[PDB]
């Protein structure tokens, strides 16, 4: 199909400014300065950032400004913040008699955010769960960055190679990631060992937490 031309991706560090161009914008009939830019975060609907080239709806920071020059429009984001990491789209009320054309989209990555070691919290099975004749251990891994992490389990000092489920890291409200790994055991397995351990490896450093029956 037809789309406005945008670069596929752009990146910058916090505090910097990024300009995203959108070409093919010139209308074919009336001088349409009807260019709008949208921001889209994963799993959410596109949000309007600017319209009629440079107007901002209420609630949108003035760090976002649009402009237009000939067959091209631009969106500049001043003072880049981690929350700006998202996809951006321009759109134009094209010469296609009563028709709107959209851009292919630009993915903005905010580089250079500080590394954060993960907080690791290990939970032993609850009394409630033991009474249902089941035992689950959960290793909660939070506030880390970058979002890649390796998780391993030990029963005493030996590797546990079955019953381990680890979720994919997801960004949370503070722009850092969280994930959890759980190990399902029988109550007999849990009591037949002196301790279990969750080892988390993040950017070369490994942290280990241990828990014992009580």
């Amino acid at each position: 199909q037809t789309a406005l031309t945008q670069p596929a991706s752009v990146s910058g560090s916090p505090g910097q400014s990024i300009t995203v161009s959108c070409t093919g914008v010139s209308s074919i009939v009336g001088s349409y300065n009807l260019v709008s830019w949208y921001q889209q975060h994963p799993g959410k609907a596109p949000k309007l950032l600017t319209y009629e080239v440079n107007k901002r709806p209420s609630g949108v920071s003035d760090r976002f400004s649009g402009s237009k020059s000939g067959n091209s429009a631009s969106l500049t984001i001043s003072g880049l913040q981690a929350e700006d990491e998202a996809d951006y789209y321009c759109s134009s009320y094209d010469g296609s008699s009563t028709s709107v054309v959209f851009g292919g989209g630009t993915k903005l990555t905010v580089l250079g955010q500080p590394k954060a070691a993960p907080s690791v919290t290990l939970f032993p099975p609850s009394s409630e769960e033991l009474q249902a004749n089941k035992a689950t251990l959960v290793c909660l891994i939070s506030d880390f960055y970058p979002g890649a992490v390796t998780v391993a389990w030990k029963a005493d000092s030996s590797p546990v190679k079955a019953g381990v489920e680890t979720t994919k890291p997801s960004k949370q409200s503070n722009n850092k990631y969280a994930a959890s790994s759980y190990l399902s055991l029988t109550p007999e397995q849990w009591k037949s060992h002196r301790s279990y351990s969750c080892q988390v490896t993040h950017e070369g450093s490994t942290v280990e937490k241990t828990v014992a029956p009580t």
Copy 2:
């Protein structure tokens, strides 16, 4: 109130047909018949399925058809295929901002296995954690399908607001989903209450677990 409103999610089996609704089109000034539906697969730009209510662009199967009756517009998909699982957005041209406005999105799941309700295990704060002035509660939500849930916390009948984080559902090895919601609090407020409840709502049905200091 959103200008356009649609169900958050719907699911259907392969072979059937389902209809996704969108309300609010008549109150958008200057919308006339500029109603479009977009389909969006993860990591990709939205793809136009229908425009001007019922026209289809080149390459869109005739399994997709749109309709508008008053303040509602609808997208009907017949002969559901696995590849139709995606997010669907209705939208409309808004004369007030000379821009396209989007509905909130509808996540459509094509049921590839039976619907599975979630196992919910709630964990109270680990001892070595309170020992260091932190009190995290973890609500583990596993083995559910489709992959979407809402989670609510209650600190003694009173809805909990701040300090809640829930991860985006992740597909595990058995092909079902898992997620966790943790609540961060101070040991003080942990003991300042009698019970804590984790309420998980999935496909209209809601389960609740509770823990109490001990």
